[PDB]
Amino acid sequence: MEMEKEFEQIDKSGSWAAIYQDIRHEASDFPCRVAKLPKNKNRNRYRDVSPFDHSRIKLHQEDNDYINASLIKMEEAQRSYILTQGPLPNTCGHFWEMVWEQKSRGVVMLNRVMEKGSLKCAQYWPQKEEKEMIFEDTNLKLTLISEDIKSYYTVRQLELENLTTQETREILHFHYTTWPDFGVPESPASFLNFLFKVRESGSLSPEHGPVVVHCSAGIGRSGTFCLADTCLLLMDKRKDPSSVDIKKVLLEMRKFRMGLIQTADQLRFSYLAVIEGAKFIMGD
Ligand SMILES: [Mg+2]
C-alpha cells in the first residue's frame, strides 16, 4: 500500500510536525461575517473557531438563523458531513433544530461532557429514560429510548419529536467514550469499529441528511472522523488507490471548515486509521 510506505517514511524521518505545519500554512481562509455579529457572540464556544459564511448551516425557524456548524460536501467521495461545535447550554435547542431540519439520522460525539474537570460540551441529550428534555425555544422534545454501553463506545437510540407537528423521528447517538484525556488513542481499532457501526446504521448514506459530527470545537477529533471516512471511500472508489493523498483530502475539507485536525498526532492517527481500515476493507 503506497500510503503505508509514505507513513513509514514520515515516521522514520520524524516529520509529522513539519507536515502538519505545512497543512496549516496552506489552509484556506474565507470570511465568517455572520459568526462575528454581536448577536451571535453567545452562540460560539470559541472565538477563534467559526463557520465560513459560504458553508455555514442556517436554521430555518422564525428567528436568528445562526449556528456554529458547517456543511462539508466531498464531491468525489459523494459524502456530506455537518461539523459543529459541542453545544452550549443556550444552543442545545438550536442543535436539535438543525438535526431536525437537516433530516440527519446520526449524531457522532467524540468527547465526554467533562474532561479533566473542564466543561467540553453541554449535556444536550437525556441521561435517563424517564427524564426527557424539552427545548421550549425550538419546540422539540427528546427522549432516551435505549442505550448500548460497549467497551470503547456507546450507541443510543433517541426519539426526537417536533412538538409543532407531533412528528417523531429516531436519532442514533454514536458516542466514542474512551478518547484519552491527552493525545490520541494508541490503536485505531476501536475508532474503526465505531466508524463501521455509523456506516452500517445508514447515518452516512444519501437517503438521510448529513451526519452531525462534533467534539468540543468540532474541528480536531471531529476532523479525524470525517477525514478517515472520506479517505477510505476514495481508496475503495478510485481506479488507482495509491493516488489518495490524505494531505490533499484534508486541505479540501478545510475549504469548508477551518482547523480540521488540530495536532500532528491527530494527523498521524488519521493516516493510521485509513491504513488499517483499508487493509480490512480492501485486503492486506
Ligand atoms: Mg434509570
Residue numbers in the entry: 1 to 284
Could you pull the original sentences from the published paper?
Protein tyrosine phosphatase 1B (PTP1B) plays important roles in cellular homeostasis and is a highly validated therapeutic target for multiple human ailments, including diabetes, obesity and breast cancer. Here, we present a new crystal structure of the dynamic allosteric enzyme protein tyrosine phosphatase 1B, the founding member of the protein tyrosine phosphatases (PTPs). However, much remains to be learned about how conformational changes may convey information through the structure of PTP1B to enable allosteric regulation by ligands or functional responses to mutations.
Moreover, the space group of our data set is P43212, which is rare for PTP1B. The next part of our analysis focuses on specific regions with backbone movements between the two chains, based on the Cα–Cα distance after superposition.
